[PDB]
Structure formats: structure tokens, C-alpha cells
Amino acid sequence: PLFDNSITSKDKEVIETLSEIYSIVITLDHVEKAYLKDSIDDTQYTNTVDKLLKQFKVYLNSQNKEEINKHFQSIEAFCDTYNITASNAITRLERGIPIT
């Protein structure tokens, strides 16, 4: 059973949101790795990353923020709740800047 036939219209929107937060995290982690293997070059990297890091903060600081932290709390945590490996990401996130 995909969607529970008693999942809030507003909840459905919240899952969809997490799916995005997720999307950022795992994606970012790659970007970073790619940059530490030159694949992508500095010019490129700093825009895109900065862009991502911005997008993130927005998702959490959306109007329906409560429910976020609610069933899916503080972030380093949420990275475990879900089988997610991203040893780079978690540093690129908790530090809110790319090149430094």
C-alpha cells in the first residue's frame, strides 16, 4: 500500500518535501566528491554548491516547519534514520559555506 488512505493532504506535501531534502543531501555529497577529483572545476562548483546550500535552508524554514523537525528531526540524525551514507555532505552541510 503506497499512500496510506489516511495520510493528510498536508502530510502528503510533507513527504514530498523530505523527498526534496533527501534529494539535496545525497546529490550534494556527490558534487563535492566530484570536485575533489577535479571532474568539476572551481568556477562551476562554488555556484552550484552555494545554490544547493541555500535551497536546503529554505525547505526546513518553510511555513510547515514543525512537522519537518517533528517526525524527521535534527539533521545529522535524519541522516541515520534513513540508510544514507554521505561522509562529505555532512561536513559541507553543518558548515554553511563551500570553498572556505
Add this chain to the structure above:
Amino acid sequence: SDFSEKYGDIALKKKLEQNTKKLDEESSQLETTTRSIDSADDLDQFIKNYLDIRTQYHLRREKL
């Protein structure tokens, strides 16, 4: 009835094995098939298929 039985086990275990080999084998070749894909239309069709494929791999692998 007794042998044929315990030998139905070997019976599949070998043929599935091959598919698995076959599939992983495929995805490597399919990776080598990587061209001037500026056609984001076709890149998607490449994705779709790689995804599609890999699904089938793990699914099999899973059994054993």
C-alpha cells in the same frame, strides 16, 4: 521424487546465476555505449533503461 526434488534446487541455482552474470555484464557494456548524447530526450531513455535493468539485477541477486 526424492532426487529430482533436491535437484530442482540445483536446477534453478545455475540458470539464475547466468542471468545475473549476463545483466552485470550488460550494464558495463551499456556504460561503454556512451555517445554524443546532447539529446536530453535520449539521455532519459538511457537512464530509464539502465535503471530498469539494474532493478532486474538486484531483484535476481536478492533471491540467493
Add this chain to the structure above:
Amino acid sequence: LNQLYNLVAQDYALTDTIECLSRMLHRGTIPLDTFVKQGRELARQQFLVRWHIQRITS
């Protein structure tokens, strides 16, 4: 029954695809951005799958 079983494969499969995309990006095949778009669209998909399992595996 096999609803989960079939789903499990997806999670792995997707992971495998995104990895490949990464390799593809490294050898230049795709522009440095198309990766993000296609990547996210995959990850997003993945999340739903993973979370969908939580429903079952809970």
C-alpha cells in the same frame, strides 16, 4: 507479498544508477548541471521508495 521484495531492488538499483551518473559526469559525458537535475529527480524517487519500505518494515 513481493511488493516489498520488488521495491527493495529499486533502492539498490537507484543507488547504482546515481553512482553511474557520477562516473558519467567525471568523464564529461553530461554537463556539470544536467547531473544535478537528473540526480535529484532520482534521489527524490529513491527517498519515496526507501520511506515506502518504512511503512512496510515498521
